[PDB]
Design a binder for this molecule. Structure first.
Ligand SMILES: [Cl-]
Ligand SMILES: [Cl-]
Ligand SMILES: [Cl-]
Ligand SMILES: [Cl-]
Ligand SMILES: [Cl-]
Ligand SMILES: [Cl-]
Ligand SMILES: [Cl-]
Ligand SMILES: [Cl-]
Ligand SMILES: [Cl-]
Ligand SMILES: [Cl-]
Ligand code: NA
Length: 129
């Protein structure tokens, strides 16, 4: 599924990401934009051989099992394919674990390089939330 911007904002709010660990909703929308272009089916291979999955590009090195990432953990205890669903529940629940792991949203490279330090409220402007 390719989400609309406000559609995704509302789904993320319903799932409790607004101000989760202090990160306002616009941070999460901004991250999703630059990670996946709001597309739940997005996949991208990393240099290390791991793959990133879904709307928040969650990595198979640490977080999900894709059967082809040696020496990898599965700390969200999920198959990586579950992160491609039109239902973002698995992605959100796994993201809550990631952001709680010590480095906040710096775990998402695109957030650090494209969203951090910017006016992230712009990403939810206009949305009925
Ligand atoms: Cl929308
Ligand atoms: Cl957009
Ligand atoms: Cl914030
Ligand atoms: Cl915001
Ligand atoms: Cl497997
Ligand atoms: Cl694996
Ligand atoms: Cl393969
Ligand atoms: Cl694991
Ligand atoms: Cl959902
Ligand atoms: Cl933090
Ligand atoms: Na893994």
């Amino acid at each position: 599924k390719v989400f609309g911007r406000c559609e995704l904002a509302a789904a993320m709010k319903r799932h409790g990401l607004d101000n989760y660990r202090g990160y306002s909703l616009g941070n999460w929308v901004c991250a999703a934009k630059f990670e996946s272009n709001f597309n739940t089916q997005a996949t991208n291979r990393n240099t290390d051989g791991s793959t990133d999955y879904g709307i928040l590009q969650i990595n198979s090195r640490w977080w999900c099992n894709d059967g082809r990432t040696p020496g990898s953990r599965n700390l969200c205890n999920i198959p990586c394919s579950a992160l491609l669903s039109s239902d973002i529940t698995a992605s959100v629940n796994c993201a809550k674990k990631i952001v709680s792991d010590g480095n906040g949203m710096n775990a998402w490279v695109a957030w650090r390089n494209r969203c951090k330090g910017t006016d992230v409220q712009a990403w939810i402007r206009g949305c009925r939330l």
